[PDB]
Paper text:
Carbamate kinase (CK; EC 2.7.2.2, ATP:carbamate phosphotransferase) reversibly converts ADP and carbamoyl phosphate into ATP and ammonium carbamate. The enzyme functions in the L-arginine dihydrolase pathway, operative primarily in some bacteria but also in the enteric protozoan parasite, Giardia lamblia. CK assembles into homodimers, consistent with the oligomeric form detected in solution. Each subunit contains an eight-stranded β-sheet surrounded by three α-helices on one side and four α-helices on the other side of the β-sheet.
A citrate ion occupies each subunit of the glCK homodimer in both glCK-citrateS and glCK-citrateL complexes. The main difference between the two structures is in the conformational state of one of the auxiliary domains. In the glCK-citrateS structure, all four auxiliary domains in the asymmetric unit are placed in proximity to the bound citrate, a state referred to as the closed conformation. In both glCK-citrate and efCK-SO4 structures the auxiliary domains are in the closed conformations, and the closure partially protects the ligands from bulk solvent. As with the nitrogen atom of the AMP-PNP β,γ-imidophosphate, the C5-carboxylate of citric acid interacts with the backbone nitrogen of Gly13. Finally, the C1 carboxyl group is bridged to Arg163 on the auxiliary domain via a water molecule.
Author numbering:
A (entry chain B): 1 to 244, 250 to 316
B (entry chain A): 1 to 316
The structure:
Amino acid sequence: MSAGKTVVIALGGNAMLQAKEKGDYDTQRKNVEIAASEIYKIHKAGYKVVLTSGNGPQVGAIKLQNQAAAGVSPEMPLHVCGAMSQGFIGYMMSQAMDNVFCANNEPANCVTCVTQTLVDPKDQAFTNPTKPVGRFYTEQEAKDLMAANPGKILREDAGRGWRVVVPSPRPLEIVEYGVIKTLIDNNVLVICTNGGGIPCKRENKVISGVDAVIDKDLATSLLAKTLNSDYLMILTDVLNACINERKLEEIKLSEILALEKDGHFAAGSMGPKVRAAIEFTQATGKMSIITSLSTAVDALNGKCGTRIIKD
Amino acid sequence: MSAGKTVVIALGGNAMLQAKEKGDYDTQRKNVEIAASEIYKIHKAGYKVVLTSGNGPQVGAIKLQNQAAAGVSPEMPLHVCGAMSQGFIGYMMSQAMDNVFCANNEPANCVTCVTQTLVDPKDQAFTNPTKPVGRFYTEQEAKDLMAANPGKILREDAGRGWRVVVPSPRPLEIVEYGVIKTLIDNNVLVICTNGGGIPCKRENKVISGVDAVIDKDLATSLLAKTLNSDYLMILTDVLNACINYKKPDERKLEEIKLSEILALEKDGHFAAGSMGPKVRAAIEFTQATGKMSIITSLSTAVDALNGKCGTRIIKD
């Protein structure tokens, strides 16, 4: 209710895609329903919740489809693809949270907000795309893709295969900030900023879309401190941050500020996750949490996960 | 504006598509920008605004893409395509509204909500798909593709040419209504119900999508009344709903009593007509609420609001 602290939670890939599942609808739906049941617990413990997600595989299938059907229907640019993934991802999430609400005989009170994020158009990211999207290929398939379509680039994504890559500039402003705040002030569980937000530039007072995909964690950090949130929570499948064996539990700003200059996090898909938690904790004095989707409430209660706090 | 009366406006194909126009992104955006200018004037008059739209050409496109790409990427069902189209269309609309707000040194206060609409799974519509979506085809390009595409049904979209046709079951409930009313109470300009809502059924307390495209005027009419909005406004490309097309008896519905338009409906004056569901929709709002419903063209909206034009349906 009106009394709850606010937690901003950035769902990950596996809220939706497990390790090399195929992206059909039902598969993703069952994963979302599993996530929703965990989220619900946080709602029931009485925190206000802002939920975000990645959109990596989902925006990549969509851009793939736009490419493959170009001779048959006009191809949409990458920001429009991002928009369409928000609809789809936002649909799945809003519906499963409505269902878990109703199953527990609570009146549904959840929405998905389409979301734009301003970025810098001449960011270096536009001349070296580095953000993996879509499903995994082999280097065998990857090489034919590039041979086949030489505008497109694949790269190795942490031993899972090869993936198409897109420009990923830093998020500067969530355009729908005011509205998101209005909703949370009003006790709505808000889903927003799916996939980091639709990448846009603002020139001459004109917001127009640009072709990128933003880091979900960097955007949610931005969102969380903009909202002056009580917690930033980034969910994975792994209960903590680890190395090489160091398992990070509660750690102070400084020590983890010290571990990241030494690239404990320049090997993992974990660095900017750490980078996003740090910035938020730095900026707000409030705790950021990186845990598994499965121990989320345990973490809030302080029973587990990597928790980062002020000094 | 906290003092404002609320107006629920359904935008038409022409919000996004004009004349035989191609559906590239830039063309459609251009059209949204034009719609947004007109809308801004209603917000600037000081009215609260909930904006809806169709999604027929855009969801059929998306569905086209999923079918063409099915061998290379998993093909998404129609309700999931509906969701994506809200994403696409709501993004265009919000951005456009944002821009016109900024251009007028007014801070952005606008958002699209993904919207689910409940229907009846047994609704006859499911046995008789009727809603044209996507591009137009020759008769012959069409047969070429129900031999090819068994089950996928096409139909003669009104002496313009052939089109895919899908179940259009009647809307029963806007799942996000409460949130939409909360936004409106807080004076946010809300875009929602784009394409009439993602069609869903609710069974045993579980909501799940069904493969359909709901009439967006029916869904909007339903939303307006659930909101007890002050007006419901359906914007098209014709300044008015009309009677006896091409007689010298061709009359122009201007201000008109509920009783009189109902009877006209009953006698089949709009029946073989694009205005059919639009009149049904305004009737249903006005009959439920006593409030004025308006059928106008995008380019004379405020004048309609100001009572200088358009078909304005008033209670008995």
